[PDB]
């Protein structure tokens, strides 16, 4: 909206590898991570000055 500062996009990375099965073995677990991506808004300006004789 020309006054906002940043635009943000989310990314999620899952995680987890299988393990061989065992009745009394430890249960492996899956998980995930999340990062956010910011792009800054740049405002440029340009002007003019005009005179009567010009």
């Amino acid at each position: 909206s020309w006054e906002d500062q940043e635009i943000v996009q989310g990314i999620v990375e899952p995680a987890g590898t299988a393990v061989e099965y065992g009745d009394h073995t430890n249960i492996p677990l899956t998980s995930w991570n999340a990062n956010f991506e910011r792009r800054t808004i740049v405002r440029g300006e340009l002007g003019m000055m005009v005179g009567t004789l010009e």
Binding site: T17, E20, G22, T25
Partner: protein
């Protein structure tokens, strides 16, 4: 084959099994081969159930090229590795293959390259323990556990103990060359008679608490 006798009570358990239920930690692994062991690997063992195995690398990666798929966190363990991995157990997990033609012959040996359940810690585990000396020994509640390694020198292993055989010693009496399982305790109390290298009486199975 069947009961040739009658005792006043049943045995508390069989080696490799769990008697007490509580906090436990176990991991899977592949049996590898003492032949594949790069170094001399003196101690020799038949992948018996009640033996303490050692880590010997990983087999997570699959394939033969540069792009390899890590399918699973797979541990590749050996019977007497110095890096203690866990005591093999839970015989009901596995399939009986027999012994030398007789497909129904009794066998407590896991074939090479098979998968086993190695208890890293357990409230109660039945383990075969051995004698670290040629004299009679008494194991009580406050007794420690040390397993034979793969590279136990011939001078130290005078009795010719198996590869991963758990011994069972008293504070400050660990048979030489033997490596200790940390925080391992002999829960039930037993007596091992005097033994020699030729006799090597199989020490009676014992309840043990690990970590």
């Amino acid at each position: 084959m069947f009961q040739k006798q009658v005792y006043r009570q049943y045995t508390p358990g069989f080696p490799g099994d769990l008697i007490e239920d509580g906090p436990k930690r176990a991991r899977p692994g592949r049996i590898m081969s003492l032949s594949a062991v790069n170094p001399a690997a003196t101690a020799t063992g038949p992948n018996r159930i009640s033996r303490a195995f050692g880590y010997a690398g990983d087999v997570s990666a699959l394939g033969e090229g540069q792009p390899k798929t890590i399918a699973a966190r797979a541990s590749e363990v050996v019977i007497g590795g110095a890096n203690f991995f866990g005591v093999l157990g839970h015989p009901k997990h596995y399939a009986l293959f027999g012994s030398a033609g007789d497909s129904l012959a009794p066998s407590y040996d896991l074939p090479d390259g098979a998968e086993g359940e190695f208890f890293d810690m357990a409230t109660g585990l039945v383990v075969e323990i051995f004698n670290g000396a040629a004299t009679a020994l008494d194991l009580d509640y406050g007794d420690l556990v040390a397993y034979v390694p793969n590279n136990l020198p011939t001078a130290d292993n005078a009795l010719g103990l198996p590869a991963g055989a758990l011994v069972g010693f008293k504070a400050g009496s660990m048979p030489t060359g033997l490596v200790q399982i940390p925080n391992a305790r002999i829960v039930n109390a037993i007596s091992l008679p005097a033994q020699s290298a030729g006799n090597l009486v199989a020490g009676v199975t014992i309840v043990q608490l690990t970590q």
